[PDB]
């Protein structure tokens, strides 16, 4: 009832098989101690994943095709605080949940990413406006003249 996670760092994490069921890649590998490669994700991100599996291994989870329990699913405030982390390493959390097919953790992190992206100030959106290519500068001048009376 235990499998072994051998990451790109190769830190062998012998976790429970019920932990392994959430990773649907690894739950498929159960049909294939019980080692498997994760050649990209570091094992601290994996340890975050495992601790989430410790927390919500017993939790109940939606049909993952919903709207109400998919898009308007409320977050875990515990896993809000648990994922109040690096912006960068949060993307590695995202890539880990992608790479191991861990969908409710992917959505749970995803919604917190959606929190952090929204609500940003129009000050910086005015500022961080054409960081990427995004517009011809003629249109950039036209936008700045479009609000010219106040901007």
């Amino acid at each position: 009832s235990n499998v072994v996670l051998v990451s790109g760092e190769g830190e062998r994490f012998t976790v429970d098989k019920k932990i392994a069921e959430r990773s649907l890649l690894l739950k498929n590998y159960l049909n294939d101690e019980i080692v498997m490669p994760v050649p990209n994700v570091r094992s601290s991100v994996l340890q975050k994943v495992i601790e989430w599996a410790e927390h919500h291994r017993d939790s109940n989870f939606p049909d993952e095709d919903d709207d109400d329990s998919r898009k308007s699913a409320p977050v875990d405030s515990w896993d809000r605080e648990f994922l109040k982390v690096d912006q960068e390493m949060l993307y590695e959390i995202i890539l880990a949940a992608n790479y191991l097919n861990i969908k409710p953790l992917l959505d749970a992190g995803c919604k917190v990413v959606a929190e952090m992206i929204r609500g940003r100030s129009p000050e910086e959106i005015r500022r961080t406006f054409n960081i990427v290519n995004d517009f011809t500068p003629e249109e950039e001048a036209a936008i700045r003249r479009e609000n010219e009376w106040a901007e």
């Binding site: 294939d32 050649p39 790479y99």
Partner: protein
């Protein structure tokens, strides 16, 4: 092959493209602005891309690898039986001495010891085809009374050829030890005059399998099936399609499949649900005919190609279907896991990329097969149980791996290369665990043949350009398992070994020739030779040369990268593996 196709295609055009007044090759920076020497002039808008060392030939290269691995690894290696009509000497009957030797060589213990071995071993295949084996044991018993008769009833001739197809399938999964213990190695090589030192894996096990197929034919030719259509023709053709025969012979099996589909559509029977006023006889007939027709669609799909003019599958597993989903998921599970891959393959030859929404819907229903095969029963000792279990496990893993291959090729989603590496090793480890007794003939269905056909193609092909660590570790087990495939495949096995060799020498060909920049048009022999050989096999598929002989005795009339290209064209030639 070659275009620009680099990383981070930008959003808005620069001034140089507006001067340029053509299509916006909105790369970093352009293939056209670099062609005008104004590379940096198209760079100077905002966020000047990144390193100019991302291998920009590689996406074009994988787009043409789609062209290859469609038109070679199914079509070019298997589906071109380019033979002749003049250079093939005639055979008028020629089985009154040949198939009658199998009338001679067949023994009753040699029948029933195959029959009883294949009972729990293969008890899903014929159970998917016909059901009961004891009626078939009864037909082998009456067959020694139905052996050399005079009142050869047409129906009874179908029953006679039925067990030749059954014997074909029994050869197709029996290991060679029990084969030499039940049969005799030598009287075949006596009758052929060939070598006595030919334990059956050395070439003649599958030949005797094809001889049992041929003795099914020799009685089916006497059945007059073109004037006598019936379902057992299609059932035994399912049983023969389980063998390597559709790959070793595409064209004959195409016409036999054509007659089987005409046979089915003679009945004009579509729905498989026992309604209110239905006969229970007709009820069970429809229930059987369901799995019959979906296995028939599976046979339609595996031979599908340019030599397949008449199609059968007209339904979609997602999103003008005929009888789709009004059917109990028992062995149409075996069809639906194939039709899953079917809808993938209307985007292999065509470079039009499918919507990724569809591919992720496919990613959703992938796990439905993954945990509906877990929704079955389980028997450790009934070999058909773990047999069908490993078949469906292999099929969902195969379509999964090919799907992540498609993800990397068409759009390059996150970590999909490592998904390819992972599912490749999982499938190969499943083969390794079935290197055992009772499970060596889990490794004999042509699904593993066509799966390794893709794996040793693309892993070697990505080893060509990216000398990666995991691709090298997988390439070691590739070269090991390529030799360690079962002998039930035979000629295409050796063609696959030559294909592995030619792709390794194609890697060496990339190693010896630097890729020539010509603005953004890149040049290598790897480009042009693979441009040419696919078109060679298409010109073989352009069957005018087999019809130029049909319209009379008519005879028609039709640099650095010209030399080493045309040195590798015959150095490691494709003509070894056309046939």
């Amino acid at each position: 092959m070659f275009n620009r196709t680099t990383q981070l295609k930008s959003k808005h055009p620069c001034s140089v493209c507006t001067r340029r007044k053509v299509k916006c090759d909105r790369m970093i920076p352009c293939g056209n602005c670099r062609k005008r020497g104004q590379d940096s002039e198209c760079m100077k808008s905002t966020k000047l891309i990144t390193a100019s060392s991302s291998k920009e030939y590689l996406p074009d290269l994988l787009l043409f690898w789609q062209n290859y691995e469609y038109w070679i690894t199914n079509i070019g290696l298997y589906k071109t039986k380019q033979r002749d009509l003049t250079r093939t000497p005639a055979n008028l009957d020629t089985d009154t001495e040949e198939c009658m030797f199998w009338m001679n060589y067949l023994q009753k213990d040699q029948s029933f010891q195959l029959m009883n071995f294949a009972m729990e071993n293969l008890g899903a295949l014929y159970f998917g085809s016909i059901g009961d084996i004891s009626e078939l044991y009864l037909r082998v018993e009456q067959y020694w009374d139905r052996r050399a008769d005079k009142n050869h009833s047409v129906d009874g001739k179908y029953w006679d050829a039925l067990i030749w197809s059954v014997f074909t399938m029994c050869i197709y999964y029996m290991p060679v030890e029990k084969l030499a213990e039940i049969f005799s190695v030598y009287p075949l090589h006596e009758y052929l005059g060939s070598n006595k030192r030919l334990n059956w894996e050395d070439g003649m096990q599958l030949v005797m399998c094809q001889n049992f197929a041929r003795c099914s034919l020799f009685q089916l030719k006497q059945c007059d099936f073109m004037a006598h259509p019936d379902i057992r023709l299609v059932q035994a053709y399912l049983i023969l399609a389980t063998t390597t025969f559709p790959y070793d012979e595409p064209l004959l099996a195409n016409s036999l499949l054509t007659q089987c589909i005409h046979t089915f559509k003679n009945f004009h029977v579509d729905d498989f649900r026992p309604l209110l006023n239905d006969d229970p006889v007709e009820s069970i007939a429809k229930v059987t005919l369901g799995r019959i027709f979906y296995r028939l669609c599976g046979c339609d799909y595996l031979q599908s190609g340019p030599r397949k003019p008449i199609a059968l599958h007209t339904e979609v597993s997602s999103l003008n279907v005929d009888v789709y989903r009004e059917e109990n998921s028992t062995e149409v599970l075996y069809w639906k896991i194939i039709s899953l891959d079917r809808d993938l393959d209307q985007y292999l030859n065509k470079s039009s990329k499918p919507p990724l929404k569809t591919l992720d819907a496919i990613r959703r229903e992938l796990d439905i097969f993954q945990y509906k095969v877990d929704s079955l029963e389980e028997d450790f000792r009934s070999n058909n149980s773990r047999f069908q279990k490993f078949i469906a496990l292999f099929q969902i893993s195969t379509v999964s791996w090919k799907l992540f291959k498609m993800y990397l090729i068409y759009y390059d989603t996150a970590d999909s290369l490592l998904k390819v590496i992972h599912y490749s090793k999982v499938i190969i480890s499943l083969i390794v665990n079935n290197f055992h007794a009772k499970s060596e003939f889990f490794n004999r269905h042509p699904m593993v043949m066509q799966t390794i056909t893709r794996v040793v193609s693309f892993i070697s092909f990505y080893q060509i350009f990216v000398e990666s660590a995991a691709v090298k570790q997988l390439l070691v087990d590739l070269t090991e398992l390529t030799a360690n495939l079962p002998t039930i495949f035979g000629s295409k096995l050796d063609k696959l070994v030559y294909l592995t060799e030619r792709l390794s020498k194609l890697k060496l060909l990339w190693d010896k020739v630097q890729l020539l920049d010509s603005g953004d048009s890149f040049y290598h022999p790897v480009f042009k030779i693979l441009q040419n050989d696919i078109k060679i096999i298409e010109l073989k598929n352009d069957e005018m040369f087999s019809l130029i002989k049909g319209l009379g005795s008519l005879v028609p009339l039709n640099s650095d990268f010209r030399t080493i290209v045309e040195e590798f064209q015959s150095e490691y030639n494709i003509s070894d593996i056309l046939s």
